[PDB]
Design a protein around this motif. Sequence first.
Motif, PDB file in Angstrom:
ATOM      1  N   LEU A  59     109.583 -64.095  10.652  1.00  0.00           N
ATOM      2  CA  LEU A  59     108.184 -63.893  11.005  1.00  0.00           C
ATOM      3  C   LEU A  59     107.365 -63.620   9.748  1.00  0.00           C
ATOM      4  O   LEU A  59     107.682 -62.709   8.977  1.00  0.00           O
ATOM      5  CB  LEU A  59     108.054 -62.746  12.003  1.00  0.00           C
ATOM      6  CG  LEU A  59     108.696 -63.018  13.366  1.00  0.00           C
ATOM      7  CD1 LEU A  59     108.586 -61.811  14.284  1.00  0.00           C
ATOM      8  CD2 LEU A  59     108.066 -64.241  14.011  1.00  0.00           C
TER       9      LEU A  59
ATOM     10  N   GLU B 136     106.059 -64.295  17.864  1.00  0.00           N
ATOM     11  CA  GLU B 136     106.618 -65.641  17.792  1.00  0.00           C
ATOM     12  C   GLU B 136     105.626 -66.675  18.310  1.00  0.00           C
ATOM     13  O   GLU B 136     105.348 -67.679  17.640  1.00  0.00           O
ATOM     14  CB  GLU B 136     107.926 -65.711  18.584  1.00  0.00           C
ATOM     15  CG  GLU B 136     109.095 -64.973  17.947  1.00  0.00           C
ATOM     16  CD  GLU B 136     109.684 -65.711  16.759  1.00  0.00           C
ATOM     17  OE1 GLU B 136     109.315 -66.884  16.541  1.00  0.00           O
ATOM     18  OE2 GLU B 136     110.517 -65.116  16.045  1.00  0.00           O
TER      19      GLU B 136
ATOM     20  N   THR C  76     108.900 -73.321  22.600  1.00  0.00           N
ATOM     21  CA  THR C  76     109.167 -72.784  21.273  1.00  0.00           C
ATOM     22  C   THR C  76     110.603 -72.282  21.210  1.00  0.00           C
ATOM     23  O   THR C  76     111.033 -71.509  22.072  1.00  0.00           O
ATOM     24  CB  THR C  76     108.193 -71.654  20.930  1.00  0.00           C
ATOM     25  OG1 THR C  76     106.865 -72.181  20.827  1.00  0.00           O
ATOM     26  CG2 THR C  76     108.578 -70.999  19.616  1.00  0.00           C
TER      27      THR C  76
ATOM     28  N   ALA D 145     113.451 -70.085  19.437  1.00  0.00           N
ATOM     29  CA  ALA D 145     113.541 -68.904  18.590  1.00  0.00           C
ATOM     30  C   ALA D 145     114.618 -69.092  17.529  1.00  0.00           C
ATOM     31  O   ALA D 145     115.727 -69.545  17.827  1.00  0.00           O
ATOM     32  CB  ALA D 145     113.835 -67.662  19.431  1.00  0.00           C
ATOM     33  N   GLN D 146     114.276 -68.753  16.285  1.00  0.00           N
ATOM     34  CA  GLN D 146     115.187 -68.851  15.143  1.00  0.00           C
ATOM     35  C   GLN D 146     115.684 -70.278  14.927  1.00  0.00           C
ATOM     36  O   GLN D 146     116.741 -70.492  14.328  1.00  0.00           O
ATOM     37  CB  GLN D 146     116.369 -67.887  15.284  1.00  0.00           C
ATOM     38  CG  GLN D 146     115.992 -66.418  15.189  1.00  0.00           C
ATOM     39  CD  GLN D 146     115.551 -66.016  13.796  1.00  0.00           C
ATOM     40  OE1 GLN D 146     115.833 -66.710  12.819  1.00  0.00           O
ATOM     41  NE2 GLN D 146     114.856 -64.889  13.696  1.00  0.00           N
TER      42      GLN D 146
END
Lengths: 99, 96, 54, 82, 80
Positions: free
Chosen positions: B21, B55, C37, C39-40
């Motif tokens: 982030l 996110e 989306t 994540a990571q």
Amino acid sequence: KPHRYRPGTVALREIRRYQKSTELLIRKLPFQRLVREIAQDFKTDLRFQSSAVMALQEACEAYLVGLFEDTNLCAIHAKRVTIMPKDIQLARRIRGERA
Amino acid sequence: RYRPGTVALREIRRYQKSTELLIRKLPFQRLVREIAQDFKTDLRFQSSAVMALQEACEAYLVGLFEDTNLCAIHAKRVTIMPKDIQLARRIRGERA
Amino acid sequence: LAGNAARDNKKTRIIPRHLQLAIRNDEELNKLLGRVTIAQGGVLPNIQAVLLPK
Amino acid sequence: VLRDNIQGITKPAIRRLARRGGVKRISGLIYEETRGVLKVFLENVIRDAVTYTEHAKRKTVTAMDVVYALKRQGRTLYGFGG
Amino acid sequence: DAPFHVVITSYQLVVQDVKYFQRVKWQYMVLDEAQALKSSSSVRWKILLQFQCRNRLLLTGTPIQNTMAELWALLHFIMP
DNA sequence: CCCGGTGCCGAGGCCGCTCAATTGGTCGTAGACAGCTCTAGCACCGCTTAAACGCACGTACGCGCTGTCCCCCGCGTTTTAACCGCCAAGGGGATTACTCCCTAGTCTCCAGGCACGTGTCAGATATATACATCCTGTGCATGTACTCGG
DNA sequence: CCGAGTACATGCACAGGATGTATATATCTGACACGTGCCTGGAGACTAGGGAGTAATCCCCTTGGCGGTTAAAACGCGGGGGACAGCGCGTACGTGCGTTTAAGCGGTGCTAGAGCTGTCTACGACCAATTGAGCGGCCTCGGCACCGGG
């Protein structure tokens, strides 16, 4: 001696007229033949309703109107009074259709 | 001489490869709690909720920066501008 | 496509990065999940042609 | 010092977000505008999520409420549940 | 703060690092194997003359009798 | 574009029938509410330091201007078909007959979802060697100029 | 006064070396990975009952197919204003250095409420009978389509 308006005057006149009225700007029968051609390519021996064809014409014409609005915004952002295929491709790209 | 920008560019590439982030956790959380305080007082937040907000927010800003950069390139400019952002959101449908 | 991306990355275990590469590298997987989306998983490396030096 | 939480988003942070977004050159007026659009986004998601939290009779905002707000906003996210 | 006196700098590190080295003042300079200064049009000569200094020292066994430009460059570098 | 005349078919109001909305009556079950708890969210404080903030400098990108060349724009005349009515008949829908598929209930039973502890195991960091690109220095050959001789 | 030649300057090419780059390897560790038994929510098997849509006709409108009429599409022309390229001025946006700040860490303390749970209950699905609100249908009529002069 023959009277001629400067370029763009009649263009803005048509902008005010076609933006003024609601009428459909695409001919009925050719668009119907196009719908029957594409639908004929997808599935053979298809029948259609007049309300369905007019619905396709309304949705298509309105979609092209909005796409021409965003396209004109792309040209004006490009500092050009003329829309361009790159303006259309940018409009659809930011819209996410071809993205 | 070797073309400059060197290290810095390498760190842009590596920082793009390694995913984390880019917005600071505590400031972003203070912003979230401040914005939520107006809607409802005495709110509590889950760490997974704040991380999800960061996110989705960072992803939205990345995409908006992509379309904005496309607007700048379409303007024959390599620098993004608030008019590029406003055009990006306009064609996106988020405003006007 | 995820195992293919893992083999391209020389990894025997699927990671969210490999899932992102598999989903985004495919056109139809990017059409359905384009609003999703990961994540990571990061994003596909991309550099515009106008941003290249010289 | 005294500074706003919307100003808590730093110019180098926005610069990194644009670098991930593929932006080589960033104007000076980009940062404040990006803070504005960011505030609009958080005002859009947090309103719906907090509304779910109020309908749930809970004083704690969970991650599921965020996933649902993003879902109804088209922002839907994976990995946090749902 | 300047807790340093004598340092050792590489030839190429002086050209690449010349931006950081030109911001410091030095009262003396020592040069081992000074035959690299035989060319007056090289960047090392002008880079060495760009730094502000008082005295200079060059210890080398170079054969200045081969070309008069080598002995003239070594004499004009210390005494312009 | 605005105004007065005519005109027509689509808007709006009435008739009548029926099927959905309503009234009355029952069971039960999801929920409202209180009781208990234990996780996680909150608050705080210190050592570390990476990132942020401020400033200097100049280099390259925005942006404004100019010029050419053309590629659309407005207008006139010329050619194609979209559009507005009749006439079969091909389908979209009413009407009746009837069965395979699913519902519901109740036991019998395979399967997965964690609490826990144990043993691996890719794989996240870093370090160094091997590779490659170019920056710099050296050397050799060629060209230009000046001087001297005829 | 002109040509020959010697000397000095210079430029290009090759080779060395330094620095940037990238992959190969090492290692301890969070996390996949793997038993060990629990069981309770599932998954399926086995009777009995329900039911809606498939299938075959068949009546009835809404398509698809004939010949004209002008209205719009199309072809051309001419010049005019707009796109695109070149160029330059200015300034601001990037990069580096130094100072500053609060971000990340993880260590401790505290309690608030999301969650599990246990009990008692009003609300709604459900079923049957009755009633009138809505809707197909039909007709009369008037708001706006059409139009030609200001």
